[PDB]
Amino acid sequence: MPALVIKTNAKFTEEEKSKATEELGNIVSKVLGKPISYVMVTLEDGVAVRFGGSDEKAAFMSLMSIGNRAVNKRASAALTKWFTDHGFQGDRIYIVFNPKSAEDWGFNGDTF
Amino acid sequence: SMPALVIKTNAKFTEEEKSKATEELGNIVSKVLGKPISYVMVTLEDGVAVRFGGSDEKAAFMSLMSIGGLNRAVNKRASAALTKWFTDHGFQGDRIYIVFNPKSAEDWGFNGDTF
Amino acid sequence: SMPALVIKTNAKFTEEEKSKATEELGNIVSKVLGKPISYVMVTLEDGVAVRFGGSDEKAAFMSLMSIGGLNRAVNKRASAALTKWFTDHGFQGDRIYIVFNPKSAEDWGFNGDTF
């Protein structure tokens, strides 16, 4: 099951945040080959961000999935496109990939 | 060697409710991990936009980091005890997400020094 | 080789204090890590419920991610330099908790591409 954690200094409305987690979650499902059921998306807006010395609009992202280099390039491009289509500049978008193991994952009070 | 629990959720808590939660969740981590009750760092972020399984219904994402001390047996006990806290406080156990991140001694800092 | 610093704290900052803080803390990361400020990313979330050592007194949790470039030798200088900022800005040094998490080149993304 993949997880996407997003921090940004942009301010979103509740409607914008709800739509965003839906669209970004659907992007993760398509690129990663998992059903939408397994996708967890977290969005924290209005956090103080400084990237390259500037506090201009920016976004930081971490993607955790239970089990590569090929997919990460594809994931990087698809997630960035959403932000560039919503007022962001592609050089202010930052993604970190952290794949994890089954025993290090919990759900419904049990591991895998 | 103090473990850390980082919690993000879309539920809305009052200030008193957040205060009780960090104490209770922290005490749970300490008991299961065999660490003293005090020696535990807990972070709780409420009111964050969360979507799990397509739904933005009440959900919680958690990361538990400990320098070692996270084998498969302990993780199952911690997952169960933490989930019990959430199911006892209005959550559904299938909306609770836990990640375990074992780490190294040189990769952990406290009081300006690593271990 | 861009570094990333993620900060959670229960202290309350004005917008100006947060703005000064991301600049000062970022410059520290650039200094300790030997990288230019152009490649440095800093995120600061204040007013999060934090309990460290049983107390909800002012405390801070930090994660520092760098593509390699993190031996224990740097980790101690980074831990000390980062802690000094907090002890100089109203925090107690034994309430400051830092995680170092080096990641691999294939595990890092920017501008739609990995390294």
Author numbering:
A (entry chain C): 14 to 80, 83 to 127
B (entry chain A), C (entry chain B): 13 to 127
According to the publication:
T. vaginalis evades host immune responses by producing homologs of host proteins, including cytokines such as macrophage migration inhibitory factor. T. vaginalis macrophage migration inhibitory factor (TvMIF) helps to facilitate the survival of T. vaginalis during nutritional stress conditions, increases prostate cell proliferation and invasiveness, and induces inflammation-related cellular pathways, thus mimicking the ability of human MIF to increase inflammation and cell proliferation. Thus, TvMIF facilitates parasite survival during infection and binds to the human CD74 MIF receptor, triggering epithelial cell inflammation and proliferation pathways linked to the progression and pathogenesis of prostate cancer. The production, crystallization and three structures of N-terminally hexahistidine-tagged TvMIF (His-TvMIF) reveal a prototypical MIF trimer with a topology similar to that of the human homologs (hMIF-1 and hMIF-2).
The r.m.s.d. for superposing Cα atoms of TvMIF trimers with the hMIF-1 trimer is ∼1.1 Å, while that with hMIF-2 is ∼1.2 Å. The hMIF-2 structure has an inhibitor, 4-IPP, bound in the tautomerase inhibitory site in the amino-terminus. The N-terminal residues of His-TvMIF obscure this inhibitor-binding site, which is otherwise accessible in both hMIF-1 and hMIF-2. The obstruction by the N-terminal extension explains why 4-hydroxyphenylpyruvate does not co-crystallize with His-TvMIF since its expected binding site is blocked.
